[PDB]
């Protein structure tokens, strides 16, 4: 079987640059290499097909060269709603093969996040468990720092975070932290407070409640 | 326009088996070669099966890792294509697309994916408790809600607001293992804060393997 090598796997690029994607396969492939774009949540759409011809719809600073066994997908100026997975696929021999895939992200200006801090839902509470939620929304770079106080106790083990992929509309990432505790523990204490820390700030953030009110 | 639109995922236990189906339109399906392509962390993009038109005797193919364990099949008079799998594995666990190959050549269209997952646990049903809106949540002119998804298995879950007629602003965060097992995660969305109280919030959560399909009014603390 022939093996796709896109490397490297992930791309760094500022708006308005041209990047340059990768593909070399272990054996000749002729020009029969595809190019697929899948963005966060989404299918691979076709883009290129047999090295260099770009399918209908798409933009023209796509574009696609090489034969042989080395190939480069193009984007000529870069724009954030190109911000997805690329990879390559090989029809010249049975079975058809794909590359693992080259990440781009898209640079922006750094964004502080917004902090926002929930309180666990009355229902939750009913069943006997507090989750505590505190969303880190639309920051660049992706770096962040969340710690948990309760009454000024740093939390530990308790906690949980997420974070979104590289947004295409805006290149920013959310975060999510979640700190959850028995209805017990969360009664017997007052504040919960979340702090944030983030190159775009100039000092950490703290957003916090009394627990009951 | 051509779709493709896959169904049959879900919870299967190791050696069990589950049939995949995709239902195709917008072109002429009994010309044309359609294949299951699976994508997983681990393996990347895979294809996985093929099965060729009735003309040239619906001639199958498999990936060698799947053969002897799955058969394709179709039904041109359904636009069907069906993907049986046997004696699952761990690792089959992936999500599973169905795909037009235009005869031997690119994966010109493709389904949005159908999950499947191969596990000794079971199946649960999520709990869905509201993220409320107050000035906690609230960042000058900014205000978000949400809806916090807890305590399901397996993956995954679909979260919409307001029946998907809200969509800018909507994060939902991949979902994290929980150390009971089960799975947890957060949607949420960012709304102009004088919209809190005047305008309604509802999150519409869909766990098809526990069937279920929740709508949560989200409201302001
Ligand atoms: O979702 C955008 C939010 O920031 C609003 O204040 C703008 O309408």
């Known amino acids: 079987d022939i093996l796709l090598t896109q490397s490297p796997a992930i791309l760094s690029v500022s708006p308005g640059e041209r990047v340059s994607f990768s593909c070399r396969a272990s054996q000749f492939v002729g020009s029969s290499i595809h190019w697929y774009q899948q963005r966060t949540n989404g299918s691979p759409r076709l883009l290129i097909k047999?090295?260099?011809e770009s399918m209908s719809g798409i933009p023209s600073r796509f574009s696609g060269s090489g034969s042989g066994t080395d190939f480069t997908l193009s984007i000529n100026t870069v724009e954030s709603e190109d911000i997805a997975d690329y990879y390559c696929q090989q029809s010249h021999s049975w079975p058809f093969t794909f590359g693992s895939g080259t990440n781009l992200e898209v640079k922006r200006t750094v964004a502080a996040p917004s902090v926002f801090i929930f309180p666990p839902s009355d229902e939750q509470l009913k069943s006997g468990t507090a989750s505590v939620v505190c969303l880190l929304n639309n920051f660049y770079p992706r770096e962040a720092k969340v710690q948990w106080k309760v009454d000024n106790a740093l939390q530990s083990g308790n906690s949980q975070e997420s974070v979104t992929e590289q947004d295409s509309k805006d290149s920013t990432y959310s975060l999510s932290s979640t700190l959850t505790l028995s209805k017990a523990d969360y009664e017997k204490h007052k504040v919960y407070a979340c702090e944030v820390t983030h190159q775009g700030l100039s000092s950490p953030v703290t957003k916090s409640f009394n627990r009951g009110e | 326009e051509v779709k493709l639109e896959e169904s049959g995922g879900g919870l299967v236990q190791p050696g069990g088996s589950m049939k995949l189906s995709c239902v195709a339109s917008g072109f002429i399906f009994s010309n044309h070669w359609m294949n299951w392509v699976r994508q997983s962390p681990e393996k990347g993009l895979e294809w996985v099966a093929e099965?060729?038109?009735?003309?040239?005797?619906?001639?199958?193919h498999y990936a060698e890792s799947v053969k002897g364990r799955f058969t394709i099949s179709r039904d041109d008079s359904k636009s069907a294509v069906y993907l049986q799998m046997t004696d699952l594995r761990t690792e089959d666990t992936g999500v599973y697309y169905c795909?037009?190959?235009?005869?031997?050549?690119?994966?010109?269209?493709w389904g949005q994916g159908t999950t499947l997952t191969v596990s000794s646990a079971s199946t649960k049903g999520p709990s869905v408790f509201p993220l409320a809106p107050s000035s906690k949540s609230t960042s000058g002119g900014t205000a978000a809600l949400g809806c916090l998804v807890k305590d399901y298995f397996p993956e995954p879950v679909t979260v919409s607001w307001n029946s998907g007629a809200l969509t800018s602003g909507v994060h939902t965060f991949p979902a994290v293992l929980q150390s009971s097992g089960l799975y947890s995660l957060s949607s949420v969305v960012t709304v102009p804060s004088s919209s809190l109280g005047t305008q309604t919030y509802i999150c519409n959560v869909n766990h098809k393997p526990s069937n279920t399909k929740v709508d949560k009014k989200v409201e302001p603390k």
């Open positions: 795909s037009r190959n235009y005869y031997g050549s690119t994966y010109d269209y």
């Open positions: 047999y090295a260099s």
């Open positions: 099965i060729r038109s009735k003309s040239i005797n619906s001639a199958t």
